[PDB]
């Protein structure tokens, strides 16, 4: 079911590709198009091969050459596109912790929507690159239940999908109801333990049951019961439980629907997901927002920045 929008180019020729990129830079100006048409048509693993082959042919660093020939939001995308898949999430996480004021949005998005396999892969890569323990770093930069929930999630420990138990589903649905709507204040720990540790397949069933017994969708209750930090995280986790593609589709929409563009988010989501579920993301986006992902990117962005994004994205006809 899970489909990306960028795949390996067949008949890929690492050296030819380098020569092309060289031809697009060496001399007066810069052939943005040629760089943009090639790199959005090669997978992450293949860009790495292009970057290594470029060095052997020209004794120059591809990425740095492009940094010195490109500009603005376009350069940012290309640079993000060039970052090894393995290191990308950890890179965005590191920059989100760096400096006194943390970037919660990024922590929540990534940690709430990455599968256990992925999260433990991120943790190892992050410790390899930076010599810091990710969990420890997150603990240092967050606080309260938001910190607690993140720590729980970072254990990469969630129950595995298993035989579905009707008794457990009713029990857990009731616990959430008793912990939220029925209680003066909120049993934050119950929400956290349940929404943090229970399996995906199990929780989807618990949601349907929660609605049946409470009249509320769990998302309404989370909004009615919590605020800021914690609300966003629990909302993020819940939506990811339902559908990571649908969660990330909503993430893109909200990055574009206002007066500006949250370009930092536009870029991260498109790039990181281009080889996993961006096709799924596009389907869900259309499904929930009346237009294609394409048309909204077209409306919010300009120039080569726009051109690359659209080629990366695809689906003009969604
Ligand atoms: Ca040039
Ligand atoms: Ca030019
Ligand atoms: Ca530049
Ligand atoms: Ca960043
Ligand atoms: Ca910080
Ligand atoms: Ca902050
Ligand atoms: Ca309450
Ligand atoms: Ca509360
Ligand atoms: Ca409480
Ligand atoms: Ca609220
Ligand atoms: Ca906008």
From Swiss-Prot:
Keyword Magnesium: no
Motif ([IL]-x-C-x-x-[DE] motif): 311-317
Stretches forming Annexin repeats: 12-83, 84-155, 167-239, 243-314
Gene Ontology cellular component annotations, sorted alphabetically: axon terminus; cell projection; cytoplasm; dendrite; endothelial microparticle; external side of plasma membrane; extracellular space; intercalated disc
Keywords: Acetylation, Annexin, Blood coagulation, Calcium, Calcium/phospholipid-binding, Hemostasis, Isopeptide bond, Phosphoprotein, Repeat, S-nitrosylation, Ubl conjugation
Phosphoserine found at: 34
Modified-residue entries (N-acetylalanine), positions: 1
Keyword Acetylation in record: yes
Post-translational modification: S-nitrosylation is induced by interferon-gamma and oxidatively-modified low-densitity lipoprotein (LDL(ox)) possibly implicating the iNOS-S100A8/9 transnitrosylase complex.
Location of N6-acetyllysine modifications: 67, 73, 76, 94, 98
Linked residues for Glycyl lysine isopeptide (Lys-Gly) (interchain with G-Cter in SUMO1): 26
Gene Ontology MF term list: calcium ion binding; calcium-dependent phospholipid binding; identical protein binding; P-type calcium transporter activity; peptide hormone binding; phosphatidylserine binding; receptor tyrosine kinase binding
Record Pfam families: Annexin
Sites bearing N6-succinyllysine, chain numbering: 287
GO biological process, one term: response to calcium ion
Residue location of crosslink Glycyl lysine isopeptide (Lys-Gly) (interchain with G-Cter in SUMO2): 26
Subunit structure as annotated in this protein's UniProt entry: Monomer. Binds ATRX, EIF5B and DNMT1.
Record-linked PANTHER family: ANNEXIN, ANNEXIN A5
Function: This protein is an anticoagulant protein that acts as an indirect inhibitor of the thromboplastin-specific complex, which is involved in the blood coagulation cascade.
Written domain comment of the UniProt record: A pair of annexin repeats may form one binding site for calcium and phospholipid.
Family: Belongs to the annexin family.
Protein name: Annexin A5
Provenance organism: Rattus norvegicus
Lineage of origin: Eukaryota, Metazoa, Chordata, Craniata, Vertebrata
């Amino acid at each position: 079911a899970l489909r990306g929008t960028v795949t390996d180019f067949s008949g890929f020729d690492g050296e030819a590709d380098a020569e092309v990129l060289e031809k697009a830079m060496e001399g007066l100006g810069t052939d943005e198009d040629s760089i943009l048409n090639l790199l959005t048509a090669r997978s992450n693993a293949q860009r790495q091969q292009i970057a290594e082959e470029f060095e052997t042919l020209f004794g120059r660093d591809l990425v740095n050459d492009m940094k010195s020939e490109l500009t603005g939001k376009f350069e940012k995308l290309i640079v993000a596109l060039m970052k090894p898949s393995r290191l990308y999430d950890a890179y965005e996480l590191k920059h989100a912790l760096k400096g006194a004021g943390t970037d919660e949005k990024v922590l929540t998005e990534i940690i709430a929507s990455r599968t256990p396999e992925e999260l433990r892969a991120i943790k190892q890569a992050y410790e390899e690159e930076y010599g810091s323990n990710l969990e420890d770093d997150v603990v240092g930069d967050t606080s309260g239940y938001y910190q607690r929930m993140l720590v729980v999630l970072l254990q990469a420990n969630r129950d595995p999908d298993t035989a579905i138990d009707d008794a457990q589903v009713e029990l857990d649905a009731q616990a959430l109801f008793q912990a939220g709507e029925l209680k003066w204040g909120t049993d934050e720990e119950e929400f956290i333990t349940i929404l943090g540790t229970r399996s995906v397949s199990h929780l989807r069933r618990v949601f349907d049951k929660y609605m049946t017994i409470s009249g509320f969708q769990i998302e309404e209750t989370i909004d009615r019961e919590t605020s800021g930090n914690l609300e966003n995280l629990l909302l993020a986790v819940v939506k990811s439980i339902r559908s990571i593609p649908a969660y990330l589709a909503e993430t893109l929409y909200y990055a574009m629907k206002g007066a500006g563009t949250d370009d930092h988010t536009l870029i991260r989501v498109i790039v990181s997901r281009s080889e996993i579920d961006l096709f799924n993301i596009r389907k869900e986006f259309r499904k929930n927002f009346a237009t294609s992902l394409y048309s909204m990117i077209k409306g919010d962005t300009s120039g080569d920045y726009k051109k690359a994004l659209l080629l990366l994205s695809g689906g003009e006809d969604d």
